Amino acid sequence: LHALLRDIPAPDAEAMARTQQHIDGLLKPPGSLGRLETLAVQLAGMPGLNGTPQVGEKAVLVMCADHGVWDEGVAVSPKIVTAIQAANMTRGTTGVCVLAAQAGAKVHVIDVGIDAEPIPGVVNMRVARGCGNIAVGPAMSRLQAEALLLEVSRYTCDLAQRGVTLFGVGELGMANTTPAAAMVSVFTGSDAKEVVGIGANLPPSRIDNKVDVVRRAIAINQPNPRDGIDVLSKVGGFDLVGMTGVMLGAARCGLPVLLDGFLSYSAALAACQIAPAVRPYLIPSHFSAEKGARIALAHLSMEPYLHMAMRLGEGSGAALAMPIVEAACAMFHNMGELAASNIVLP
């Protein structure tokens, strides 16, 4: 793991300078394609993309797990919905499946801790049947968190061998917006009230209890904000650890990863804390309608491309943004050049 983190490559400044020069000469006023230009240059710098913005195969990794904190009444969805939806992921009927299919991406469903019998068709990496209730103790041991990070990291970079060059990250886990809020509060130093949202339609009257649970989780566990693994193991969850793992693996592999919503922002804060070198590889997708989204994004210094008021999760936002990544590549490789049309601009 220390080796893993140590070997994450820095972005290639040489390929990026070459990319910038090429974009400036395309058939348009310099800088007019804005964030599409910046995105193309960002991609050119990722070593796994071989010096040029390009997209080969695409995969969305959905980390599934249950949470003991569900018993504190912080979620209205029945606990079994995690297991049921994970099965639906194998049938192609969920939101991320439909949006991934539209983008030509494949969905990998990974069970890292569902509290139910194993589901055929789902990748089995389960740590336990649900994590510990963070309101009274830790979600898991540090050892468990580190081992899951490594296993998911390896699985992720292995896909790079099969032609995958663009990843999307997602989750499935009833009650997971509670540990997500705890993590965001700890990493950003923001009060729980400012980052606890309604998740999957929690009634406005049940919010107070959710905020209290988050504060108790932090008070009892005393997670160290400077140690991302300490934070994940104490007030996180297996799904959150798994998402962080996809990010470290894509980075080690020198490839881009598209974030999704609030849960993924929590995982990204942990990933960047653990290894700042991961940052250049993350690409935001949409601006989640979850209350703590603005704060988490400000700490990651990220501005999403899509404002869709989405809050489903599952990696649906990440899938929705894949066409945008392909568009930056299309602009780069297919547009004509000013000089060829004899156009000279100041």
Added chain:
Amino acid sequence: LHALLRDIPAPDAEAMARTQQHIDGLLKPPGSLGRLETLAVQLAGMPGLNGTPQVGEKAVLVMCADHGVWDEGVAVSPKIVTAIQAANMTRGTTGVCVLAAQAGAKVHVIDVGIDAEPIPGVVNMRVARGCGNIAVGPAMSRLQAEALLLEVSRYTCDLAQRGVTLFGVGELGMANTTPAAAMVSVFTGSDAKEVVGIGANLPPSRIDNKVDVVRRAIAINQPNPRDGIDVLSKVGGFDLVGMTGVMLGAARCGLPVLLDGFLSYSAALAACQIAPAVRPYLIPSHFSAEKGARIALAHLSMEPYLHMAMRLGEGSGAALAMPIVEAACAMFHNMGELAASNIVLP
């Protein structure tokens, strides 16, 4: 034309209620897909879509024309760039061509007033070789504006006969952000300084002159804010009139039209002034990086889906958003339902 405007259909509330009921029953917490859900319902209500959100063929119509106000020094791009780029549109090397191809849409390039010899391959609907310099008089006569609106309107709804169900609108015309700003100022009652931007990289020192030209245009022509055709003919341009025409035609046809950037917002303000019934058919794409974008959008009560800091024009933003429209349709027709998985949520 009066007939045209009179026959624009109202949205079908019955199809929309049926759409809403179906979306609420899909495999996700109610309302969790946010604006994707609202977009799907909006589409269900457009009569030309036959009661359901769907997308058949797609077309981006690019209106090209030159402006006499170019002589006032409000643009750094050579005048010939309009003609050169229009030709490039037929070769598939421009920004909108590349992005339209990525979205599976076809680009129709229409010459409504380029100051050059006719370009083979471009649809010829030219009114004149460039419009009048709005700084000293009107861009065109009311008769010319009305006739172009009708001709473009008919061309647009005719495409509906060929299977097109989704339109995108764009423009090509050096110096056109000047009449666009004049129109926005007149329709919104905002001062020219608040809506005049740098267009295609105008130097910061040349801005003052651009603002003065816009004020002179308004003072000399005295366009009536309550008469959109009066406004277009006096301080608009052939390209602006053409874009307004695509919007009236799509509306008459009961089909959706995706806006692009600032120029298209100007045209949409005119279209909605002329016939408020056009409003339900417009769909925003991106939030243009042009200075007056925020004001124009607030008056149209529109919130774009994409924040890409784009300012190229050509209909590039509209093309970039087509996948989002297809995504709302995919969600609607392909997602599974809660009842089939025996999931019951409060």
